[PDB]
Amino acid sequence: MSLVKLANTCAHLQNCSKVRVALTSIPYTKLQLQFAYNLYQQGFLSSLQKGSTMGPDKDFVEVTPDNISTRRLWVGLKYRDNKPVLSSCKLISKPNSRIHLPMEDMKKLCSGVTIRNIKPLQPGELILVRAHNNIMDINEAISKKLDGEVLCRVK
Amino acid sequence: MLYELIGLVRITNSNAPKLEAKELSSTIGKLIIQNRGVVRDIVPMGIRYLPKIMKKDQEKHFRAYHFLMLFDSSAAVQSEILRTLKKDPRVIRSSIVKVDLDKQLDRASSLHRSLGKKSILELVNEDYQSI
Amino acid sequence: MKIQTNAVNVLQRTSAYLKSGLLKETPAWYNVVASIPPSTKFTREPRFKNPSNGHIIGKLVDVTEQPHANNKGLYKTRPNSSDKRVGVKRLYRPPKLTYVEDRLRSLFYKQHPWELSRPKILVENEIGDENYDWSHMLQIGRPLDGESVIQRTMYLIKTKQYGDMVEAYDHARYEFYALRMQEETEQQVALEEAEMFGSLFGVSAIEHGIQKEQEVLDVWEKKVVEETELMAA
RNA sequence: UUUUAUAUAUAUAUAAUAAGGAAAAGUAUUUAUAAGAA
RNA sequence: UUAAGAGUUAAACCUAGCCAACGAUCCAUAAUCGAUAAUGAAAGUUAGAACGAUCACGUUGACUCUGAAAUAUAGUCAAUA
RNA sequence: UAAUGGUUUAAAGGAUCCGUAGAAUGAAUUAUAUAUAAUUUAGAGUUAAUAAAAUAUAAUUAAAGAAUUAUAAUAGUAAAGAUGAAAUAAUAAUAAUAAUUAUAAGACUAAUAUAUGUGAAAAUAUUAAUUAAAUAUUAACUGACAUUGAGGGAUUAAAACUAGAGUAGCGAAACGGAUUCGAUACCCGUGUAGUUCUAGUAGUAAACUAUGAAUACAAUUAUUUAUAAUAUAUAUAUAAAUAAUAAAUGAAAAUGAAAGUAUUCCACCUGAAGAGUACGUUAGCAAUAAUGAAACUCAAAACAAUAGACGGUUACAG
RNA sequence: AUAUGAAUUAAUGCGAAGUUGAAAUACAGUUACCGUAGGGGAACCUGCGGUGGGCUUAUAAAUAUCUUAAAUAUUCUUACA
Ligand SMILES: [Mg+2]
Ligand SMILES: [Mg+2]
Ligand SMILES: [Mg+2]
Ligand SMILES: [Mg+2]
Ligand SMILES: [Mg+2]
Ligand SMILES: [Mg+2]
Ligand SMILES: [Mg+2]
Ligand SMILES: [Mg+2]
Ligand SMILES: [Mg+2]
Ligand SMILES: [Mg+2]
Ligand SMILES: [Mg+2]
Ligand SMILES: [Mg+2]
Ligand SMILES: [Mg+2]
Ligand SMILES: [Mg+2]
Ligand SMILES: [Mg+2]
Ligand SMILES: [Mg+2]
Ligand SMILES: [Mg+2]
Ligand SMILES: [Mg+2]
Ligand SMILES: [Mg+2]
Ligand SMILES: [Mg+2]
Ligand SMILES: [Mg+2]
Ligand SMILES: [Mg+2]
Ligand SMILES: [Mg+2]
Ligand SMILES: [Mg+2]
Ligand SMILES: [Mg+2]
Ligand SMILES: [Mg+2]
Ligand SMILES: [Mg+2]
Ligand SMILES: [Mg+2]
Ligand SMILES: [Mg+2]
Ligand SMILES: [Mg+2]
Ligand SMILES: [Mg+2]
Ligand SMILES: [Mg+2]
Ligand SMILES: [Mg+2]
Ligand SMILES: [Mg+2]
Ligand SMILES: [Mg+2]
Ligand SMILES: [Mg+2]
């Protein structure tokens, strides 16, 4: 659940978008996998694949402690109209300052009101929240009435 | 520890230059063996004119009998051998250098190693040495 | 340089100009460029397979795949340092193309250095038009060269007429020797026949070389005598 | 790919073979609001 | 001793502890605060006049009676005028 | 009414590292209520094996060398020494300078040589030895044991001081000779402390990469440098150093794998001058070192770059 | 201790028109500055080490080769092959 690793992944995705690589690899963990899946559902990523440190898996490989160290999640980035679809990826809740919002504050943040110095949600942006070790978008966490930790911004 | 000593013995008797080198080799070898040492090799380098007119004590030397001694011994008696060499009028110059044995137990002298014979087994050649 | 936006979006800028009223008449290229969209993605694409030899890039063999010991006699139980390093650069580098022929060719001109002296033409003619059966070395529309020997070697190995590279290479070499001997005999006999039937030749290769040597040597004579006079003083 | 054949010592090398085609019309409240100048 | 805990005070006997560079102790300054006032987009910042809540004081210090509750704008003693 | 700030050059990275607290941050999987527990190996470590000069770094010990000075001898003669040119109370007829030898003294280490490298920094390249530390890969093992780090601890150039010895060269101060309107300076002579060694004090440098440490990522090229192969050839692959760059960043110069994209921790800065000054406190034998203001004055002050002028600024032509 | 004053006394700030050195900025005419020591009223001078915020401002010891020169390449317009 390392927020440090999520920050590293965010910076990695930004760097990959700058140099316009079509594929990239991130650490294979539950938090990273859920975060990548949430980005993919929103259309920010082209494809998810499971693979080794060298590349995607040619055949399906079961994940065990023997090969966990060498496992990676390969994400395909999107570049449309000469612009990267996934342009900026940032953290709201940082390791030094972690922000856990109740549901009403989360609605206020979505409704243009700055809460705890977090810029309000922007129209084409996505904010991700963690509740009970599950990653979702802010809208779903509000619909689920779940108080949660506000992690990251993807615009 | 394997130590290579290179001594430059003075020649005073023009008729038997090797005598003083013999006495020095006997002394050093006796010391090494009597202090729990081994004398792996004694290579008799020849008579050579010194590069300069080198001076030890008051005598001035222009030529010397060079000789080499490869011996396995301990550090303390090695320093003792060096001390005896330095104060001895017979030894114009002396130098002891370690030959490392970390990888191979047996090693030849610098001269044979430079020629290409890494070990003393190669020096004495290899027949019926697979026993 | 940065990926340039303005070059590929000329249609959008022109459309803005036209709709705003800044430009009154559509350019002649507008409809064409609208019909044919420019490609607006400039992405570095991963490569997973080397076309020349078929080596697969981006594959790691897991610990489970080895249930036996390796050459040193050790079972693979944990990944080693090289296995635990991300290899994205391997995907994004252009793969080096390697061919088996490149080795045999290097052998052939090492074995026959004077075959290099025979001139070669690198102008391709038409590659697609080649219709060759390599059961025999000589091809119409092709010279007889070492590359024919390597091609026959590959044909021999492909059909498994011979098993090892060396055997097929030697067989093709001997066919090459026979054919080149035949050509040499044709040339010698043709020249002899020409002289037999009254043909007169103005210049020969030896005399041509002698003439060129004579010009060079005369210039060298002048320069050496002048230089000796200069150096003497 | 998959499966099988021949050959060779459960395995290896060559050859052949590939199952993924579906169509139908109609069914606003958007939020809080940070200006500089000589 | 108190209606009541506690080195709060008084007595006795033990232990060696307690606070402190995330600032003790000491010094200077200050009545405190609000759904009060001002200001700012806001977080905040300033004031504590006016409205309201709490505390302390009634020229200064200590003690005593009464009392449920007072070291009382009481009494006694002293200090100042 | 600007920190939705900065610290290579404008103010600002601590001289360097080690490490305590941190109410600082921090690996993976599952289960249970924001953690705890159990499992795991990607960080961090331990032990071996292999390869390599682990040669370089630290201490100690033992040696080598070219030269310098002084003294003595030999011969030999009139000058020698220095400077732009000269002259110096102590160069030479008391035979000087120069030459050839022979003695003693200390200090220093030419080529290699690039500080390439090694070291936390300061530093460190004449040789040998004793001990200590430092490399890559593989194998096995621990199982987050990690990062940074207030206070603190250690080391820290040159100068300086305290004791001893040493004192060949160099050389503050001083004494004189020159130059100059003047010389209190540059030049010249004699030269004290110091430079040197041992045992200490102190803890400051333009202690600089004017750039704190760690982690993830980031497009190329060229060289090397170090390994691993495969048969000099694969212009061979994997790493790090160096140089030029792309993007990015920047006030620009420029940085360029960090001055980029991000995360964590620490130190530092808030106009110029007054001022690193005064006073106090702490430590030192002392010089001093650390901590460190305020009033008053002003609309200044500084950085990068631009175009000029100028230079006892270079080169090229005419 | 918290203050209020004080003969005596340490430093620093401003300004009016001037006065004196030639220290810095160019190779600033002895490269500047950093730390330290001494000399000097002061500017500065000198010794020791460090930095470049000065030398990256970097720019030759030179010579070059043989196949049909054409009735053939040069000429060619979607032809012919
Ligand atoms: Mg009690
Ligand atoms: Mg008490
Ligand atoms: Mg008591
Ligand atoms: Mg306090
Ligand atoms: Mg008051
Ligand atoms: Mg009050
Ligand atoms: Mg009031
Ligand atoms: Mg107040
Ligand atoms: Mg009133
Ligand atoms: Mg009262
Ligand atoms: Mg009262
Ligand atoms: Mg009154
Ligand atoms: Mg503000
Ligand atoms: Mg600065
Ligand atoms: Mg630093
Ligand atoms: Mg040297
Ligand atoms: Mg540390
Ligand atoms: Mg030094
Ligand atoms: Mg002394
Ligand atoms: Mg001296
Ligand atoms: Mg001198
Ligand atoms: Mg001057
Ligand atoms: Mg002088
Ligand atoms: Mg000293
Ligand atoms: Mg000390
Ligand atoms: Mg100082
Ligand atoms: Mg300092
Ligand atoms: Mg500094
Ligand atoms: Mg900057
Ligand atoms: Mg001071
Ligand atoms: Mg000047
Ligand atoms: Mg000057
Ligand atoms: Mg003087
Ligand atoms: Mg330095
Ligand atoms: Mg300059
Ligand atoms: Mg410069």
From Swiss-Prot, chain A:
<keyword id="KW-0496">Mitochondrion</keyword>
<dbReference type="GO" id="GO:0005739">
    <property type="term" value="C:mitochondrion"/>
</dbReference>
<dbReference type="GO" id="GO:0005743">
    <property type="term" value="C:mitochondrial inner membrane"/>
</dbReference>
<dbReference type="InterPro" id="IPR000630">
    <property type="entry name" value="Ribosomal_uS8"/>
</dbReference>
<keyword id="KW-0689">Ribosomal protein</keyword>
<dbReference type="Pfam" id="PF00410">
    <property type="entry name" value="Ribosomal_S8"/>
</dbReference>
<keyword id="KW-0687">Ribonucleoprotein</keyword>
<dbReference type="GO" id="GO:0005763">
    <property type="term" value="C:mitochondrial small ribosomal subunit"/>
</dbReference>
<dbReference type="GO" id="GO:0003735">
    <property type="term" value="F:structural constituent of ribosome"/>
</dbReference>
<dbReference type="InterPro" id="IPR035987">
    <property type="entry name" value="Ribosomal_uS8_sf"/>
</dbReference>
<protein>
    <recommendedName>
        <fullName>Small ribosomal subunit protein uS8m</fullName>
    </recommendedName>
</protein>
<comment type="function">
    <text>Component of the mitochondrial ribosome (mitoribosome), a dedicated translation machinery responsible for the synthesis of mitochondrial genome-encoded proteins, including at least some of the essential transmembrane subunits of the mitochondrial respiratory chain. The mitoribosomes are attached to the mitochondrial inner membrane and translation products are cotranslationally integrated into the membrane.</text>
</comment>
<comment type="subunit">
    <text>Component of the mitochondrial small ribosomal subunit (mt-SSU). Mature yeast 74S mitochondrial ribosomes consist of a small (37S) and a large (54S) subunit. The 37S small subunit contains a 15S ribosomal RNA (15S mt-rRNA) and 34 different proteins. The 54S large subunit contains a 21S rRNA (21S mt-rRNA) and 46 different proteins.</text>
</comment>
<comment type="similarity">
    <text>Belongs to the universal ribosomal protein uS8 family.</text>
</comment>
<dbReference type="GO" id="GO:0032543">
    <property type="term" value="P:mitochondrial translation"/>
</dbReference>
From Swiss-Prot, chain B:
<dbReference type="InterPro" id="IPR000529">
    <property type="entry name" value="Ribosomal_bS6"/>
</dbReference>
<dbReference type="InterPro" id="IPR014717">
    <property type="entry name" value="Transl_elong_EF1B/ribsomal_bS6"/>
</dbReference>
<keyword id="KW-0687">Ribonucleoprotein</keyword>
<dbReference type="InterPro" id="IPR035980">
    <property type="entry name" value="Ribosomal_bS6_sf"/>
</dbReference>
<dbReference type="GO" id="GO:0005743">
    <property type="term" value="C:mitochondrial inner membrane"/>
</dbReference>
<dbReference type="GO" id="GO:0005739">
    <property type="term" value="C:mitochondrion"/>
</dbReference>
<comment type="similarity">
    <text>Belongs to the bacterial ribosomal protein bS6 family.</text>
</comment>
<comment type="function">
    <text>Component of the mitochondrial ribosome (mitoribosome), a dedicated translation machinery responsible for the synthesis of mitochondrial genome-encoded proteins, including at least some of the essential transmembrane subunits of the mitochondrial respiratory chain. The mitoribosomes are attached to the mitochondrial inner membrane and translation products are cotranslationally integrated into the membrane.</text>
</comment>
<keyword id="KW-0496">Mitochondrion</keyword>
<protein>
    <recommendedName>
        <fullName>Small ribosomal subunit protein bS6m</fullName>
    </recommendedName>
</protein>
<dbReference type="Pfam" id="PF01250">
    <property type="entry name" value="Ribosomal_S6"/>
</dbReference>
<dbReference type="GO" id="GO:0070181">
    <property type="term" value="F:small ribosomal subunit rRNA binding"/>
</dbReference>
<dbReference type="GO" id="GO:0005763">
    <property type="term" value="C:mitochondrial small ribosomal subunit"/>
</dbReference>
<comment type="subunit">
    <text>Component of the mitochondrial small ribosomal subunit (mt-SSU). Mature yeast 74S mitochondrial ribosomes consist of a small (37S) and a large (54S) subunit. The 37S small subunit contains a 15S ribosomal RNA (15S mt-rRNA) and 34 different proteins. The 54S large subunit contains a 21S rRNA (21S mt-rRNA) and 46 different proteins.</text>
</comment>
<keyword id="KW-0689">Ribosomal protein</keyword>
Swiss-Prot record, chain C:
<comment type="subunit">
    <text>Component of the mitochondrial small ribosomal subunit (mt-SSU). Mature yeast 74S mitochondrial ribosomes consist of a small (37S) and a large (54S) subunit. The 37S small subunit contains a 15S ribosomal RNA (15S mt-rRNA) and 34 different proteins. The 54S large subunit contains a 21S rRNA (21S mt-rRNA) and 46 different proteins.</text>
</comment>
<keyword id="KW-0689">Ribosomal protein</keyword>
<dbReference type="GO" id="GO:0005739">
    <property type="term" value="C:mitochondrion"/>
</dbReference>
<protein>
    <recommendedName>
        <fullName>Small ribosomal subunit protein mS23</fullName>
    </recommendedName>
</protein>
<dbReference type="GO" id="GO:0003735">
    <property type="term" value="F:structural constituent of ribosome"/>
</dbReference>
<dbReference type="GO" id="GO:0005743">
    <property type="term" value="C:mitochondrial inner membrane"/>
</dbReference>
<comment type="function">
    <text>Component of the mitochondrial ribosome (mitoribosome), a dedicated translation machinery responsible for the synthesis of mitochondrial genome-encoded proteins, including at least some of the essential transmembrane subunits of the mitochondrial respiratory chain. The mitoribosomes are attached to the mitochondrial inner membrane and translation products are cotranslationally integrated into the membrane.</text>
</comment>
<comment type="similarity">
    <text>Belongs to the mitochondrion-specific ribosomal protein mS23 family.</text>
</comment>
<dbReference type="GO" id="GO:0032543">
    <property type="term" value="P:mitochondrial translation"/>
</dbReference>
<dbReference type="InterPro" id="IPR016939">
    <property type="entry name" value="Ribosomal_mS23_fun"/>
</dbReference>
<dbReference type="GO" id="GO:0005763">
    <property type="term" value="C:mitochondrial small ribosomal subunit"/>
</dbReference>
<keyword id="KW-0687">Ribonucleoprotein</keyword>
<dbReference type="Pfam" id="PF13741">
    <property type="entry name" value="MRP-S25"/>
</dbReference>
<keyword id="KW-0496">Mitochondrion</keyword>
